[PDB]
């Protein structure tokens, strides 16, 4: 569901506690994979360490269908909702 995806995208922004780095990268990469699809941008330069990490995470999902990405995204948000509370 696209409606379910939009909801999760909003709720994830209001978690009582901010997710761990690993969890944020999972969220970022699946969000991109579900909306844009296969990565279509240039990898950031040497000094942009945070940007390179996010780019690599999304790159790793290449080939994943938007449907599967959406499902994994929503499932993770529900997981984070129960873990950190909202």
From Swiss-Prot:
The modification N6-malonyllysine is found at residue 54. The modification N6-succinyllysine is found at residues 7, 16, 54, 76. The modification Phosphotyrosine is found at residue 28. The modification N6-(2-hydroxyisobutyryl)lysine is found at residue 54. One of its GO terms (cellular component) is Golgi apparatus. It comes from the Eukaryota. GO terms for molecular function: fatty-acyl-CoA binding. Keywords: Acetylation, Endoplasmic reticulum, Golgi apparatus, Hydroxylation, Lipid-binding, Phosphoprotein, Transport. The modification N6-acetyllysine is found at residues 7, 18, 50, 54, 76. One of its GO terms (biological process) is fatty acid metabolic process. It is found in: Endoplasmic reticulum; Golgi apparatus. An acyl-CoA binds at residues 13, 28-32, 50, 54, 73. The modification N-acetylserine is found at residue 1. Residues 1-86 form the ACB domain. Pfam families: ACBP. Monomer. Binds medium- and long-chain acyl-CoA esters with very high affinity and may function as an intracellular carrier of acyl-CoA esters. It is also able to displace diazepam from the benzodiazepine (BZD) recognition site located on the GABA type A receptor. It is therefore possible that this protein also acts as a neuropeptide to modulate the action of the GABA receptor. Belongs to the ACBP family. This is Acyl-CoA-binding protein. It comes from Bos taurus (Bovine). The lineage of its organism: Eukaryota, Metazoa, Chordata, Craniata, Vertebrata.
């Amino acid at each position: 569901s696209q409606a379910e995806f939009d909801k999760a995208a909003e709720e994830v922004k209001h978690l009582k506690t901010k997710p761990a780095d690993e969890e944020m990268l999972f969220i970022y990469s699946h969000y991109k994979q579900a909306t844009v699809g296969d990565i279509n941008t240039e990898r950031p330069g040497m000094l942009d360490f945070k940007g390179k990490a996010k780019w690599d995470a999304w790159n790793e999902l290449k080939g994943t269908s938007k449907e599967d990405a959406m499902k994994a995204y929503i499932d993770k948000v529900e997981e984070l909702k129960k873990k950190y509370g909202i």
